[PDB]
Design a protein around this nucleic acid. Structure first.
Lengths: 92, 92
DNA sequence: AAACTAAGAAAATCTTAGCAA
DNA sequence: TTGCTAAGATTTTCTTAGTTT
């Protein structure tokens, strides 16, 4: 899990670390700490948690696991394309 | 990590679970077991290991973390494109 | 040969109780 | 308010020693 990806996505979502945690289902008593540990790279979330974070952040989960900046941008762009626009890439 | 992504990529590489493990730097004494645990979804590898696996399998690491079949295919295709080709999608 | 598994050892994360910016 | 951290409690993976396909 790439800490820069998590942080960038969180800041674009405009929410605090704690709020991101709460919305992803982490107990209010541990949300701030846990989300900070993830963003600072102290501990890694499991894939199930990453999926819940991605849901809150409105991103595809694999964005958080893509080190290649150009591919990560593609993933975010693809995310916002409608199903007809995706067909155009699919054929491509 | 998505066990089907790992299996599909390994089978395309034409290598055993053990061989994949050995090539990815897992000790010869535990490669078979660990690789199997990952592919069967018994335990998840950490991201560092996933990166080592992806290098052996000649895939971008985020393929292993992409649940969306259509995006996963984009990632696979993108992996094989040269610079000039990646430039034209980045535009598109 | 390759795939697979149990169980104890080992190492990781999670919760708690805060402090710092 | 938000970001951040230590450390013990908790939960996970890893190694070993195999059996199964």
């Amino acid at each position: 899990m790439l800490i820069r990806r998590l942080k960038d996505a969180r800041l674009r979502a405009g929410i605090s670390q704690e709020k991101l945690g709460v919305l992803a289902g982490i107990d209010e008593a541990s949300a701030s700490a846990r989300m900070n540990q993830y963003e600072k790279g102290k501990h890694a979330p499991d894939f199930e948690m990453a999926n819940r974070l991605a849901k809150v952040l409105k991103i595809p989960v694999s964005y958080l696991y893509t080190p290649e900046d150009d591919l990560a941008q593609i993933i975010l762009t693809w995310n916002e394309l409608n199903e007809q626009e995706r067909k155009r890439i699919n054929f491509y």
